[PDB]
Design a protein around this nucleic acid. Structure first.
Ligand SMILES: [Mg+2]
Ligand SMILES: [Mg+2]
Length: 55
RNA sequence: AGUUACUAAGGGCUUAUGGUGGAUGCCUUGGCACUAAUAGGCGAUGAAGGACGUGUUAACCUGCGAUAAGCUUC
């Protein structure tokens, strides 16, 4: 399902996606370390989407 | 003058009860010995075995490997 959407995308757009999700993942981990993450599941979703884009 | 019971500090016997203890009985996500087939290897495209790390999840165990409690396809 998600893999189909990324397959339609080109390569350059994918590397933009991976860097943006990397940045967001760092922010989520920092906010969690400050006790300011209301939604604690976005860390897992970011990592899975990151792993899928890598695949 | 004569023959005399009561005493139980404590102990003994019988029976009943309580406590420590896990023997006997029943059972088992565990072992043992084989039968009928399959198969008889893995590794420089990095092995067997380990260390470390990975959670929204204290530690331990299991899974996994910076794509880290999972990724794609049929
Ligand atoms: Mg007495
Ligand atoms: Mg007595």
């Amino acid at each position: 399902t998600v893999a189909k959407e990324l397959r339609q995308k080109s390569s350059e757009e994918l590397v933009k996606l991976v860097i943006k999700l990397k940045g967001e993942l760092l922010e989520y981990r920092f906010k969690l370390a400050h006790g300011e993450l209301d939604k604690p599941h976005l860390i897992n979703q970011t990592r899975r989407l990151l792993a899928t884009i890598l695949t």
